[PDB]
Design a binder for this molecule. Structure first.
Ligand SMILES: O=C1CCc2ccc(OCCCCN3CCN(c4cccc(Cl)c4Cl)CC3)cc2N1
Ligand SMILES: CCCCCCCCCCCCCC(=O)O
Ligand SMILES: CCCCCCCCCCCCCC(=O)O
Ligand SMILES: CCCCCCCCCCCCCC(=O)O
Ligand SMILES: CCCCCCCCCCCCCC(=O)O
Ligand SMILES: CCCCCCCCCCCCCC(=O)O
Ligand SMILES: CCCCCCCCCCCCCC(=O)O
Length: 578
């Protein structure tokens, strides 16, 4: 604790230290060029080495916030590039870093990163691996200034492994592109869950987050006592509360302390934490958050004894309601790791609603005597949706499943723009193929995680340009009722059909020369416009048009004159049967 930067350097190692220092500066000086950040990192790294050689060297006793802030305020172009951020450099350190944190631009006006060609990437990866990888780590950090820097380093090493493996293969793009796409989607999803959880914390209070934490931790750690789960929920709530604040050092120390406690109490938490409590301090907390569920105890009794049958239900509930409800959620969650967290919260709220009415009634024991019967329809509702949607997914393929969702959701809310209907239907289709490859024991948790990012992304684009009231209603609802609200959407019978546009249903020779993905998006776009023009069209009528369209595209591939002549016949023949 004498020299804090030296302790960081020796715990993290030189390689990880430089990467984290690059990420940290890129998240505050988002508008500075890459070569300026490399200059700061090398200067900070050479300074850290003097503290490692002599803890008593000058300025080595200063705190990390003081050293970081002081270094940040030496940037010559600070005031010219960052207007009122330079005014932070006139405040004491307790208030200076707070001032710096208030100017982290969430969505800066930076151009979209372009994925270069595969050959130019592998060539650059070979010619200068260090600057190639670090430039892109810089480009991502400056675009996600609130993304937890060690997790950004965790993905960065996955990018390095992808280039190392696939730049030596016979077909580079054969395995590099699928890995890069998988990394892109996974990174954008992780960055979405983090920002979404932080927004939910402030909008629905700390109590709603603790309930979620009790459910999740009991599924992961079913063998731990309730007191151990409740203690972890309190610490996890403090970790997520301060990590949402944005301070990197305070967030990292909280996560390190929790992982340090969990690894010292493995015998009272889980038996699955063995492999990752041996990992270095940089990776411990990250892995524990992704550890698989431990096995639940063998013969666990029914919940009716403590929560329905025996007396003192209202008495034990009235003494401390959230504790009693927390025990119910703990006992229910750890017996059902196959449930989604939100489903467990629906049952807790249902049990809560019952006690608040029953404990004030004439005969309370008679009142809640069958509270478990109310849980059956709530449990069976998502279980039937998974079976129904993936018996349909098994009848079709992924692309044909997306077309079914596309027709179904366009009918329900025709007011949503076509690009949003296309994008969400394709993503919701990816949830089908991603999760129904799993067995029944882990289908609902899979769907919950993937639906929550698609449904929030749906309203992230919808909140900016609101069109449909029924979509905003489902996203103003709590995260527990969000998915059932969207499932409860009915076909809009008050929607007048869209005016026919000839240029919309016009097709040129570009579709045959476009890529497979670009051809699908173009075909799926016209399918939305077909449903918006004729919502009352039936399944067999739409299939006839889709079959004729596929035959129209295949027959026309002369090619230019076919799309115009055969296209005029397709449009007219469809207008006679719709
Ligand atoms: O040289 C390369 C190779 C890799 C690559 C892929 C896509 C690409 O262009 C797409 C446009 C920007 C997409 N980014 C991808 C990374 N992504 C993200 C967000 C949070 C965490 C994490 Cl870990 C991540 Cl990855 C943000 C959005 C360019 C490149 N450039
Ligand atoms: C140990 C106390 C943990 C927190 C108390 C659990 C209460 C569960 C009630 C469930 C209803 C609220 C769910 C929500 O708002 O998201
Ligand atoms: C150099 C600055 C170091 C700040 C980041 C430390 C990362 C420690 C992460 C530990 C954890 O996630 O539990
Ligand atoms: C993924 C939620 C936790 C993110 C904060 C990192 C804390 C890591 C140690 C706590 C592990 C909690 C396990 C869990 O996610 O249920
Ligand atoms: C389409 C992807 C499969 C459909 C899954 C729908 C059921 C999701 C249940 C989530 C929840 O508990 O609210
Ligand atoms: C487009 C509007 C979003 C559609 C709702 C997605 C919910 C996931 C499927 C659940 C269901 O099939 O009922
Ligand atoms: C007015 C009707 C004009 C023709 C409408 C074109 C509809 C195109 C839908 C394409 C979806 C199926 C694609 C395929 O079968 O591969």
């Amino acid at each position: 604790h004498k020299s804090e930067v030296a302790h960081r350097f020796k715990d993290l190692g030189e390689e990880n230290f430089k990467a984290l220092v690059l990420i940290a500066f890129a998240q505050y000086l988002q508008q500075c060029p890459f070569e300026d950040h490399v200059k700061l990192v090398n200067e900070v790294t050479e300074f850290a080495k003097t503290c490692v050689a002599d803890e008593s060297a000058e300025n080595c006793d200063k705190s990390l916030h003081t050293l970081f802030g002081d270094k940040l305020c030496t940037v010559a172009t600070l005031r010219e590039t960052y207007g009122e951020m330079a005014d932070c450099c006139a405040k004491q350190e307790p208030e200076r870093n707070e001032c710096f944190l208030q100017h982290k631009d969430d969505n800066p006006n930076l151009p979209r990163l372009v994925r270069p060609e595969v050959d130019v990437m592998c060539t650059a990866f070979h010619d200068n691996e260090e600057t190639f990888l670090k430039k892109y780590l810089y480009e991502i950090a400056r675009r996600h200034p609130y993304f937890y820097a060690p997790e950004l380093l965790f993905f960065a090493k996955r990018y390095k492994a992808a280039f190392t493996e696939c730049c030596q293969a016979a077909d580079k793009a054969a395995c590099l592109l699928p890995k890069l796409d998988e990394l892109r989607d996974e990174g954008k999803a992780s960055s979405a869950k983090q920002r979404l959880k932080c927004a939910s914390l402030q909008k629905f209070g700390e109590r709603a987050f603790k309930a979620w934490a009790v459910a999740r931790l009991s599924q992961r750690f079913p063998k731990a006592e309730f007191a151990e789960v409740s203690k972890l929920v309190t610490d996890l709530t403090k970790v997520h509360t301060e990590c949402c604040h944005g301070d990197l050092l305070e967030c990292a120390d909280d996560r390190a302390d929790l992982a340090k406690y969990i690894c010292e109490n493995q015998d009272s938490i889980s038996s699955k934490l063995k492999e990752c409590c041996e990992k270095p301090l940089l990776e411990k907390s990250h892995c524990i958050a992704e550890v698989e569920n431990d096995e639940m105890p063998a013969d666990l009794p029914s919940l009716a004894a403590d929560f329905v049958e025996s007396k003192d239900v209202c008495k034990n509930y009235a003494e401390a309601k959230d504790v009693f409800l927390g025990m119910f959620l703990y006992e229910y969650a750890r017996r059902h790791p196959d449930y989604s967290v939100v489903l467990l919260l629906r049952l807790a709220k249902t049990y809560e609603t019952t006690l608040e009415k029953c404990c004030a009634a004439a005969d309370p024991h008679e009142c809640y005597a069958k509270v478990f019967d109310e849980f059956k329809p709530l449990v069976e509702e998502p279980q039937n949706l998974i079976k129904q949607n993936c018996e349909l997914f098994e009848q079709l393929g992924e692309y044909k499943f997306q077309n079914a969702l596309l027709v179904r959701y366009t009918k329900k809310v025709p007011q949503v723009s076509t690009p949003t209907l296309v994008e969400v239907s394709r993503n919701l289709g990816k949830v089908g193929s991603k999760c129904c490859k799993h067995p029944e024991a882990k289908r609902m948790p899979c769907a919950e995680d993937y639906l929550s990012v698609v449904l929030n992304q749906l309203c992230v684009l919808h909140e900016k340009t609101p069109v449909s009231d029924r979509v905003t209603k489902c996203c103003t609802e709590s995260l527990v009722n969000r998915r059932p609200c969207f499932s409860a959407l009915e076909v809009d019978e008050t929607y007048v059909p869209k005016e026919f546009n000839a240029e919309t249903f016009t097709f040129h020779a570009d579709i045959c020369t476009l890529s497979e993905k670009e051809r699908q998006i173009k075909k799926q776009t016209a399918l939305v416009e077909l449903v918006k023009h004729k919502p009352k069209a039936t399944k067999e009528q739409l299939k006839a048009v889709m079959d004729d369209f596929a035959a129209f595209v295949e027959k026309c591939c002369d090619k230019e004159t076919c799309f115009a002549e055969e296209g005029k016949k397709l449009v007219a023949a469809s207008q006679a049967a719709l």
